[model samples]
Target: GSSGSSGMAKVKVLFVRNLANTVTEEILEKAFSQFGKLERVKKLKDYAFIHFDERDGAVKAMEEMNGKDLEGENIEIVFAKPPDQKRKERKAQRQAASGPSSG
Candidate 1:
């Protein structure tokens, strides 16, 4: 990993794991959008999350889609912690004296 240019970390999650390499992104936007409106989507190596406007819709989608066959594979889904509701992960609060990481 690089020391810089990683950019500001976005804190968000609904925690979809065990993504089907063939299905995650290919079907994510189109399929998930069917559940409700989503602000955005993030599909990383083997995980992803979606931003939705309504909590009820998200939960409904999460429950409905969990373990559903997508591209013939079952993907795991679960709820996640809301940003700021948890402590220790708030990057905005850090040791200024820590300075740039060095070897």
Candidate 2:
């Protein structure tokens, strides 16, 4: 029933680049919504960050939609990373993998 992921610490988001400046949010959503609930689409002049409710959706969307034609421009969709935040997240992910196997 919620309209956004404002309540979560973080939502699964993807970094989409190489978009044409003329593209609209509606276009981005239309292309990405096929995989999962599109929580938010923050668009820039030539890029966007697409937030989804689930990580699986982000992964699947990225895998299947990368390099797809949108507005006659080839777009790239992949895991988003802010270098500062990415390192912390990567460390946690490594621990996550380490935990289940070593225990």
What clash pairs does model 1 have? none
RMSD of 1: 14.9
The lDDT for every candidate, in the order shown, is 0.67, 0.77
TM-score of each: 0.62, 0.65
lDDT of 2 at 26: 86
Compute the lDDT for candidate 1.
0.67
| Weakest 10 consecutive residues of candidate 2 by summed lDDT | 85-94
Model 2 TM-score (2 dp)? 0.65
Candidate 2: tens digits of C-alpha lDDT, residues 1-103: 8674322223268889999867878888978898888888998877999888787777778768888888888898767764363334333333344545553
lDDT tens digits, residue span 7-95, model 1: 33233335677777685564676776788776667788877886666666576667678777877778776676676554555455555
